[PDB]
Amino acid sequence: SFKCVNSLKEDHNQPLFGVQFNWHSKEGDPLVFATVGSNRVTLYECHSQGEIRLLQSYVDADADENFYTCAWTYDSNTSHPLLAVAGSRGIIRIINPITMQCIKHYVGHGNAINELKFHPRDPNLLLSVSKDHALRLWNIQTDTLVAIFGGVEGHRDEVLSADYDLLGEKIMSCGMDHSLKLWRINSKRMMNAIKESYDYNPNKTNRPFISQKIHFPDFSTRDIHRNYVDCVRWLGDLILSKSCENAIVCWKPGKMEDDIDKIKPSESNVTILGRFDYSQCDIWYMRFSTDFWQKMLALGNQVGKLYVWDLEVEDPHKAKCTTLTHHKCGAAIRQTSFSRDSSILIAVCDDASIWRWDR
Numbered sequence: 343s344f345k346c347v348n349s350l351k352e353d354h355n356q357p358l359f360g361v362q363f364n365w366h367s368k369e370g371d372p373l374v375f376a377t378v379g380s381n382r383v384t385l386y387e388c389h390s391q392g393e394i395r396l397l398q399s400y401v402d403a404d405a406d407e408n409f410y411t412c413a414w415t416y417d418s419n420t421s422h423p424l425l426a427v428a429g430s431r432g433i434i435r436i437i438n439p440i441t442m443q444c445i446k447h448y449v450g451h452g453n454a455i456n457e458l459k460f461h462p463r464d465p466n467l468l469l470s471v472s473k474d475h476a477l478r479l480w481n482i483q484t485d486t487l488v489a490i491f492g493g494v495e496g497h498r499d500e501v502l503s504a505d506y507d508l509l510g511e512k513i514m515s516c517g518m519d520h521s522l523k524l525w526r527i528n529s530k531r532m533m534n535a536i537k538e539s540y541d542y543n544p545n546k547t548n549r550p551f552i553s554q555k556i557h558f559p560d561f562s563t564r565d566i567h568r569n570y571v572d573c574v575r576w577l578g579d580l581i582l583s584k585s586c587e588n589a590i591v592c593w594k595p596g597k598m599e600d601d602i603d604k605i606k607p608s609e610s611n612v613t614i615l616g617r618f619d620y621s622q623c624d625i626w627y628m629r630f631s632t633d634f635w636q637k638m639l640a641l642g643n644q645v646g647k648l649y650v651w652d653l654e655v656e657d658p659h660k661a662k663c664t665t666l667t668h669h670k671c672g673a674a675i676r677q678t679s680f681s682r683d684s685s686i687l688i689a690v691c692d693d694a695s696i697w698r699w700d701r
């Protein structure tokens with residue numbers, strides 16, 4: 343079980359929209375997590391007796407910047423951790439977490455970036471989702487835009503979230519148009535574009551890097567939720583997604599026995615395997631998270647209550663729920679993050695507060 347061992351508050355007093363533990367931290371090193379809020383990203387180290395040590399922040403030059411998301415990766419030659427952040431300005435910043443120096447930046451999205459995710463098998467492939475209705479896949483080793491996922495049959499409104507499956511062969515995205523869209527990235531076209539992005543060196547060529555424009559998803563559905571879908575994650579071949587209807591739905595494209603890789607773009611069926619209901623969620627922009635092994639699922643509500651579901655059961659609908667409450671924790675929890683070993687759960691709130699729960 344989890345016990346609340348410490349709380350903290352950031353000086354800006356603005357909501358904290360994101361929190362991510364670094365799952366790429368070396369053995370023996372303390373557990374480190376990043377928070378994003380206001381025009382700032384801050385790093386903290388978790389220590390014994392619930393101590394949370396403040397390290398260093400990156401503060402954006404523009405006081406009007408709002409960071410909405412962050413994600414960790416590592417430098418592909420040195421293994422040193424790297425941190426990517428993005429928000430309202432639509433600029434992806436790659437930060438060296440040691441010195442908090444901005445190493446490089448990527449621009450292209452016509453609007454705010456709602457989420458960043460790194461590929462589970464390739465530390466150089468970064469996915470960004472934006473208010474301009476599109477997803478973008480970048481290669482941060484060669485600084486190239488590999489592909490833009492959107493267009494004529496892509497999202498019709500702001501994209502809120504996206505996730506890669508286990509092998510990083512497909513992406514599921516969701517947003518304000520109420521839809522969930524599947525984009526396969528293991529096609530011959532996408533694997534060739536990724537290979538070409540690695541061979542690109544502008545000092546050694548005259549051509550610009552040609553980005554793929556993917557106008558058609560491999561699956562699309564609006565039958566899961568009746569409002570904006572603001573968070574989606576894969577659970578194997580299954581999908582977990584949530585709207586503002588006080589529920590996380592567990593579902594899969596097609597009929598019960600349909601294989602996810604046999605699903606065609608014209609597939610009109612979905613199968614609901616369960617729904618995890620919870621209380622008091624009226625506001626938009628809340629994220630749920632799973633731990634490294636996907637044994638647990640966590641989500642906070644608008645009054646500081648934490649729900650943790652145990653996914654180590656035969657079928658999704660049998661998930662066991664545990665609730666975590668503290669008399670002082672009363673603001674909306676925007677995101678949670680588990681440490682790689684699942685021994686620590688951090689929750690971040692609307693009042694700039696950070697809450698630590700240890701098993």
Ligand SMILES: CC(F)(F)CN1Cc2cc(C(F)(F)F)ncc2-c2cnc(NCc3c(F)ccc4c3CCO4)n3cnc(c23)C1=O
Nearest residue numbers: 357359360410456457502503572573626627628629676677
């Ligand atoms: C005038 C304005 F600043 F632009 C208003 N905001 C800022 C804002 C204000 C407030 C409040 F006032 F209540 F504190 N709440 C939410 C947002 C906000 C938050 N997070 C994203 N994106 C990331 C994102 C996501 F896409 C899906 C789930 C999710 C998150 C973060 C945590 O969970 N935002 C994108 N646009 C806004 C947000 C926005 O329009």
